[PDB]
Amino acid sequence: FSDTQYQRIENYMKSSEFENKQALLKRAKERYTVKVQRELELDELALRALKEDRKRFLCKAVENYINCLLSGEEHDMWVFRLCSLWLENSGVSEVNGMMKRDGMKIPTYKFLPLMYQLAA
């Protein structure tokens, strides 16, 4: 569920509607000045809130995936998702911290199917 929400937010940020909204704001940028500046403040606040929500969802999804992999062996195939949420978010310090603390307790053989992708 956390991954679904995170992917929804990411897809919205990658959508063409977001680009159209940003382009409309920039076109409005170039007593309209006060209103344009106010709307720029508003959309900056919205962008910061969206980024915070994305970070929270990503962290929750990563930690729950690690816990699921630690719990049992029936869902080992989901390890591909975990690395996919890590290799694409190497900049985020929380993901690296969660990996370093907990993912080193995961049995190593579960990482064998994607060993080619880690080494690269």
47 binds another protein (CB under 8 A): no
Cα 75 from Cα 65, distance rounded (Å): 10
Stretch of 17-25, 59-67, 89-97, 99-107 contacting another protein, by CB under 8 A: 17-25
Q: What is the smallest separation between the CB atom of 68 and another protein, expressed in angstroms? A: 14
CB of 49 to another protein, least distance (A): 6
Alpha helices in 15-102 (DSSP H): 16-29, 32-71, 79-87, 93-102
Asked if residue 70 lies in contact with residue 106, where contact means CB atoms within 8 angstroms, the answer is: yes
Tokens matching residue 106 = 């995961």
Give the nearer residue to another protein in terms of CB position, either 36 or 98: 36
SS3 for 91? coil
Q: Which amino acid is at 25?
A: L
How many residues touch another protein under the rule CB under 8 A: the total is: 29
In the complex, which residues of this chain contact another protein (CB under 8 A)? Answer: 8, 11, 16-17, 20-21, 24-25, 27-28, 32, 35, 39, 41-43, 49, 77-78, 80-81, 83-84, 87-88, 114, 116-117, 120
